[PDB]
Design a protein around this ligand. Sequence first.
Ligand SMILES: CCCC[C@H]1C(=O)N(c2ccccc2)N(c2ccc(O)cc2)C1=O
Length: 121
Amino acid sequence: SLLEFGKMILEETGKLAIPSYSSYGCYCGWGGKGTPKDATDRCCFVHDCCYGNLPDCNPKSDRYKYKRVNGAIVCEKGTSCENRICECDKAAAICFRQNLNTYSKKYMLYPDFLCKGELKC
Ligand SMILES: CCCC[C@H]1C(=O)N(c2ccccc2)N(c2ccc(O)cc2)C1=O
């Protein structure tokens, strides 16, 4: 669910998911068009695509369980959907962490009209 993904992001990057990643670029937050602006935006694009591979799951509300094994994120056994949602979130958190060095404030509150393009998953 969104609440856990948010905590996963905070633990991983030290940034509050809601500011930092809820209105960033073309794909972080709500998005469905254009070419990802940078690496972080690409993390969100791939994250959206990951959820897209799970048509019958509900990522926002379905809660999963995960633990930290010395920093490593380990998804615990749950329903099929819960397991797959957790893996999608884990990947996004790591991706955000790997690209913190290029995160830019100029992409925060990015205007919709500047997201022009076609990028298939
Ligand atoms: C702390 C969470 C950061 C997560 C980021 C995300 O993965 N989704 C997201 C992506 C796909 C399905 C559901 C939620 N949304 C998002 C949330 C609310 C909203 O009305 C629109 C988009 C996000 O902000």
